Amino acid sequence: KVFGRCELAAAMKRHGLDNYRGYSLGNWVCAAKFESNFNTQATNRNTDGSTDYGILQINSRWWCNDGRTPGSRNLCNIPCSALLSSDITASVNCAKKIVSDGNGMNAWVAWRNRCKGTDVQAWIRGCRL
Ligand SMILES: [Cl-]
Ligand code: NA
Secondary structure (H helix, E strand, O other): EEEEHHHHHHHHHHHOOOEOEOOOOHHHHHHHHHHHOOEOOOOOEOOOEEEEEEEOOOOOOOOEEEEOOOOOOOOOOOHHHHHHHOOOOHHHHHHHHHHHOOOOOHHOOHHHHHHHOHHHHHHHOOOOO
């Protein structure tokens, strides 16, 4: 599923990401924009053989099991394919665990490079939330 901007914002808000650990809704929508272009089916292979999955490009090295990342962890305890669903529940739940591990949203390189320190509220602007 390719979400609309406000559609995703509302779905995220409903799943409790607004101000989750100090990160306002605009941060998560910006992050999802540049990681996956709002596409839940987005996948990307890393040079180390791991793969990033879904709307927030969660990495198989640490967070999910895809059965082809030797010596990796499954810290969110899910198959990586679960992160590709049109229902974003598993991605959101796993994201909550990632953002709490000490490094905040700096875990997402696109957020750090493209969202951090920008006017992130522009991403939820005009949306009925
Ligand atoms: Cl933080
Ligand atoms: Na893994």
